[PDB]
Design an enzyme around this catalytic site. Structure first.
Site, PDB file in Angstrom:
ATOM      1  N   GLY A   1       0.838  -1.182   0.000  1.00 41.27           N
ATOM      2  CA  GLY A   1       0.000   0.000   0.000  1.00 41.27           C
ATOM      3  C   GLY A   1       0.873   1.232   0.000  1.00 41.27           C
ATOM      4  O   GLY A   1       2.028   1.177  -0.418  1.00 41.27           O
TER       5      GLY A   1
ATOM      6  N   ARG B   1       3.999  -3.253   3.660  1.00 42.16           N
ATOM      7  CA  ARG B   1       4.032  -4.412   2.783  1.00 42.16           C
ATOM      8  C   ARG B   1       3.518  -5.570   3.619  1.00 42.16           C
ATOM      9  O   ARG B   1       3.969  -5.770   4.749  1.00 42.16           O
ATOM     10  CB  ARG B   1       5.469  -4.702   2.339  1.00 42.16           C
ATOM     11  CG  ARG B   1       5.627  -6.009   1.560  1.00 42.16           C
ATOM     12  CD  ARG B   1       7.097  -6.354   1.333  1.00 42.16           C
ATOM     13  NE  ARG B   1       7.763  -5.447   0.402  1.00 42.16           N
ATOM     14  CZ  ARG B   1       7.637  -5.497  -0.921  1.00 42.16           C
ATOM     15  NH1 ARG B   1       7.223  -6.612  -1.513  1.00 42.16           N
ATOM     16  NH2 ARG B   1       7.938  -4.436  -1.658  1.00 42.16           N
ATOM     17  N   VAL B   2       2.577  -6.331   3.076  1.00 44.88           N
ATOM     18  CA  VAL B   2       2.033  -7.469   3.808  1.00 44.88           C
ATOM     19  C   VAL B   2       2.525  -8.753   3.154  1.00 44.88           C
ATOM     20  O   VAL B   2       2.338  -8.962   1.955  1.00 44.88           O
ATOM     21  CB  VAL B   2       0.497  -7.435   3.873  1.00 44.88           C
ATOM     22  CG1 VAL B   2      -0.034  -8.670   4.601  1.00 44.88           C
ATOM     23  CG2 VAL B   2       0.035  -6.163   4.590  1.00 44.88           C
TER      24      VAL B   2
ATOM     25  N   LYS C   1       2.245  -7.623   8.325  1.00 44.81           N
ATOM     26  CA  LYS C   1       2.315  -6.274   7.778  1.00 44.81           C
ATOM     27  C   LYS C   1       3.599  -5.667   8.320  1.00 44.81           C
ATOM     28  O   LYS C   1       3.797  -5.594   9.535  1.00 44.81           O
ATOM     29  CB  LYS C   1       1.110  -5.429   8.198  1.00 44.81           C
ATOM     30  CG  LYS C   1       1.140  -4.000   7.643  1.00 44.81           C
ATOM     31  CD  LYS C   1      -0.202  -3.306   7.840  1.00 44.81           C
ATOM     32  CE  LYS C   1      -0.208  -1.922   7.204  1.00 44.81           C
ATOM     33  NZ  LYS C   1      -1.540  -1.266   7.335  1.00 44.81           N
TER      34      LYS C   1
ATOM     35  N   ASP D   1     -11.233   4.020   6.150  1.00 46.16           N
ATOM     36  CA  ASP D   1     -10.604   3.532   4.926  1.00 46.16           C
ATOM     37  C   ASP D   1     -11.319   2.351   4.291  1.00 46.16           C
ATOM     38  O   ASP D   1     -10.690   1.401   3.822  1.00 46.16           O
ATOM     39  CB  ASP D   1      -9.095   3.316   5.062  1.00 46.16           C
ATOM     40  CG  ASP D   1      -8.375   3.367   3.712  1.00 46.16           C
ATOM     41  OD1 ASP D   1      -8.903   4.007   2.775  1.00 46.16           O
ATOM     42  OD2 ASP D   1      -7.270   2.805   3.592  1.00 46.16           O
TER      43      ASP D   1
ATOM     44  N   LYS E   1     -12.916   0.190   1.601  1.00 46.97           N
ATOM     45  CA  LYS E   1     -12.706   0.011   0.164  1.00 46.97           C
ATOM     46  C   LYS E   1     -12.447  -1.469  -0.099  1.00 46.97           C
ATOM     47  O   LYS E   1     -11.973  -2.185   0.781  1.00 46.97           O
ATOM     48  CB  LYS E   1     -11.531   0.860  -0.349  1.00 46.97           C
ATOM     49  CG  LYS E   1     -10.188   0.561   0.301  1.00 46.97           C
ATOM     50  CD  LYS E   1      -9.084   1.451  -0.271  1.00 46.97           C
ATOM     51  CE  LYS E   1      -7.785   1.286   0.511  1.00 46.97           C
ATOM     52  NZ  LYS E   1      -6.692   2.182   0.009  1.00 46.97           N
TER      53      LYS E   1
ATOM     54  N   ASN F   1      -9.287  -3.121   1.041  1.00 52.90           N
ATOM     55  CA  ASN F   1      -9.129  -3.353   2.476  1.00 52.90           C
ATOM     56  C   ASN F   1     -10.096  -4.395   3.026  1.00 52.90           C
ATOM     57  O   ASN F   1     -10.203  -4.568   4.240  1.00 52.90           O
ATOM     58  CB  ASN F   1      -9.281  -2.050   3.265  1.00 52.90           C
ATOM     59  CG  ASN F   1      -8.096  -1.127   3.102  1.00 52.90           C
ATOM     60  OD1 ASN F   1      -7.038  -1.553   2.656  1.00 52.90           O
ATOM     61  ND2 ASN F   1      -8.253   0.134   3.501  1.00 52.90           N
TER      62      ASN F   1
ATOM     63  N   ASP G   1      -6.524  -3.458   7.505  1.00 60.00           N
ATOM     64  CA  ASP G   1      -6.049  -2.082   7.384  1.00 60.00           C
ATOM     65  C   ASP G   1      -6.721  -1.056   8.295  1.00 60.00           C
ATOM     66  O   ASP G   1      -7.566  -0.271   7.854  1.00 60.00           O
ATOM     67  CB  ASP G   1      -6.110  -1.621   5.927  1.00 60.00           C
ATOM     68  CG  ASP G   1      -5.316  -0.360   5.686  1.00 60.00           C
ATOM     69  OD1 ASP G   1      -4.772   0.218   6.655  1.00 60.00           O
ATOM     70  OD2 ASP G   1      -5.235   0.070   4.523  1.00 60.00           O
TER      71      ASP G   1
ATOM     72  N   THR H   1      -9.170   7.143   1.082  1.00 62.48           N
ATOM     73  CA  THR H   1      -8.835   6.856  -0.311  1.00 62.48           C
ATOM     74  C   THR H   1      -9.767   7.755  -1.133  1.00 62.48           C
ATOM     75  O   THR H   1     -10.945   7.896  -0.807  1.00 62.48           O
ATOM     76  CB  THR H   1      -9.002   5.363  -0.606  1.00 62.48           C
ATOM     77  OG1 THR H   1      -8.147   4.607   0.241  1.00 62.48           O
ATOM     78  CG2 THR H   1      -8.696   4.972  -2.034  1.00 62.48           C
TER      79      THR H   1
END
Ligand SMILES: Nc1ncnc2c1ncn2[C@@H]1O[C@H](COP(=O)(O)OP(=O)(O)NP(=O)(O)O)[C@@H](O)[C@H]1O
Ligand SMILES: [Mg+2]
Ligand SMILES: [Mg+2]
EC number: 2.7.11.11
Lengths: 20, 336
Positions: free
Chosen positions: B38, B42-43, B58, B152, B154, B157, B170, B187
């Protein structure tokens, strides 16, 4: 069509959160 | 429900007041593959050595967090995630930090992002979108009752689990606040007008976001889209929304009440709160208890071949996870 306009746009991929 | 939420708050507050810390260490896992990236972290899919279980780690570079001014947000993220408990919220199994990074180890949700399925299939039929929407409604009712704003929502997520249910991930912008807040975050496509207008906002922004999510799930595209965020914001503020010809009358009515610029009229933010949404005609066929209890048959179950399978995720360029011999930003992340 709206679908066609979206598909041709530059934001059809994963969208990242806003970062300043 | 009121009875349940009260007990839930007691559990949450105990963890909020005395957060879990340092529950694992890097060398207890074998890093396998990147599941997603994202703007911040980084996951990666990882395998815990002693248990053999897979998890989603994460990784946040402390210096990047500072650079992007996400210090307080990252502390919010972890403090909140470790304290919550709900059927549709991903579970934080471990957390820890080292000289260079911050780590949040969650349960691995193998079904992939709702985003990938949505884009591939094109759009979800109404009953399909409704199934997911119901879970988000219940989750927001839960979060909001704890004075938490998610910020957030979306498809990127939202993860689909082995049973076809939603797992929200997230909590990067999650915040515990009584009253209004002002941070411009989220976002682009999902921002409520009040966020863009810098006037201050509250939990009602999550309800607006739900409207955007339902619209995108059912249409296959967002209600407000463009090539650049600035153009998107212009559209959001104008408020004008057009609906696909296939949208049911009930769906359109619900959306006009969620994508409502007027706070005194936006569903979820009225006298009856979440009940205006739960009782809306579009959700008439929804058995809220059955959804919470995970007794409803999922409209779609992702394919998965054994533990460790990442077929439901896109591939990403791998990057070395460096760890300096010098501690970075120690004071800033003391409570992490
Ligand atoms: N528990 C999990 N299981 C499987 N995949 C996950 C999990 N958590 C996150 N992911 C994946 O990793 C990606 C990034 O995780 P995320 O927490 O959203 O990082 P981020 O930097 O905060 N993204 P954003 O702020 O929206 O730009 C997600 O979009 C998923 O694809
Ligand atoms: Mg994300
Ligand atoms: Mg994030």
């Amino acid at each position: 069509t709206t679908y066609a306009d979206f598909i041709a746009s530059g934001r059809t991929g994963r969208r990242n959160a806003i970062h300043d | 429900v009121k009875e349940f939420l009260a007990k839930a708050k007691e559990d949450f507050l105990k963890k909020w007041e005395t957060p879990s810390q340092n529950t694992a260490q890097l060398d207890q896992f074998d890093r396998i593959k990147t599941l997603g990236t994202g703007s911040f972290g980084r996951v990666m899919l990882v395998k815990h050595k002693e248990s053999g279980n897979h998890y989603a780690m994460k990784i946040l570079d402390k210096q990047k967090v500072v650079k992007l001014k996400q210090i307080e947000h990252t502390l919010n993220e972890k403090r909140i995630l470790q304290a919550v408990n709900f059927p549709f919220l991903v579970k934080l199994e471990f957390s820890f930090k080292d000289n260079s990074n911050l780590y949040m180890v969650m349960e691995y949700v193998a079904g992939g992002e709702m985003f990938s399925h949505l884009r591939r299939i094109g759009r979800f039929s109404e009953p399909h979108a409704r199934f997911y929407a119901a879970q988000i409604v219940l989750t927001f009712e839960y979060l909001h009752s704890l004075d938490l704003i998610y910020r957030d929502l979306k498809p990127e997520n939202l993860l689909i689990d082995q049973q076809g249910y939603i797992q929200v991930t997230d909590f990067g912008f999650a915040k515990r606040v009584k009253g209004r807040t002002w941070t411009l975050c989220g976002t682009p496509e999902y921002l409520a007008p009040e966020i863009i207008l810098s006037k201050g906002y509250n939990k009602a922004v999550d309800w607006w976001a739900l409207g955007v999510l339902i619209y995108e799930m059912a249409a296959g595209y967002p209600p407000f889209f463009a090539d650049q965020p600035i153009q998107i914001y212009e559209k959001i503020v104008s408020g004008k929304v057009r609906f696909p010809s296939h949208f049911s009358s009930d769906l359109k009515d619900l959306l006009r009440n969620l994508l409502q610029v007027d706070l005194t009229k936006r569903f979820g933010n009225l006298k009856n709160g979440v009940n205006d949404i739960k009782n809306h005609k579009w959700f008439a066929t929804t058995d809220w208890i059955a959804i919470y209890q995970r007794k409803v048959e999922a409209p779609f179950i992702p394919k998965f071949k054994g533990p460790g399978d990442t077929s439901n995720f896109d591939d990403y360029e791998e990057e070395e996870i460096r760890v300096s011999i010098n501690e970075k930003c120690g004071k800033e992340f003391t409570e992490f």
